[PDB]
């Protein structure tokens, strides 16, 4: 009967959509993590730069 085939097809479509949602959620999580790490890296780099400038300003005359 067509009803059983429709139910199986609705199973298939739902499984695919669930996989899509899994991927999407993972992508969002990845975006959230990567960015925090990048912020930390940027701050570390900024601290190093200023420190280097201070060292340079401290060991040069004019």
């Amino acid at each position: 009967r067509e009803i059983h085939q429709d139910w199986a097809n609705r199973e298939y479509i739902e499984i695919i959509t669930s996989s899509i949602k899994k991927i999407a959620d993972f992508l969002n999580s990845f975006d959230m993590s990567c960015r925090s790490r990048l912020a930390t890296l940027n701050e570390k780099l900024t601290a190093l730069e200023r420190r280097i400038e201070y060292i340079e300003a401290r060991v040069t005359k004019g």
Binding site: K44, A47, R51, Y54, A57
Partner: protein, 78 residues
């Protein structure tokens, strides 16, 4: 500037205020990322790019002008 605007006897007050500032910097460094207290102190004192900072210059100025010709020594109490 406050130290430079007072006599040499304000050195204790300057030291206390510097200690308070160092404590504040230590407290803030737990979460934030600031330069070492020495770097900020030297930048404010202009000792980073000069052999002598503002504090020593002011001390010498006070010694030359207000300290020597106004204070009388007492050996019993030092």
């Amino acid at each position: 500037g406050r130290f430079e605007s007072e006599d040499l006897t304000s050195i204790v007050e300057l030291d206390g205020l510097l200690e308070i500032n160092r404590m504040t910097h230590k407290l803030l460094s737990r979460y934030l990322t600031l330069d070492g207290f020495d770097a900020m102190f030297r930048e404010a004192n202009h000792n980073v790019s000069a052999p002598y900072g503002r504090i020593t210059l002011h001390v010498f100025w006070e010694l030359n002008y207000d300290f020597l010709p106004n204070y009388c020594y007492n050996g019993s109490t030092n």
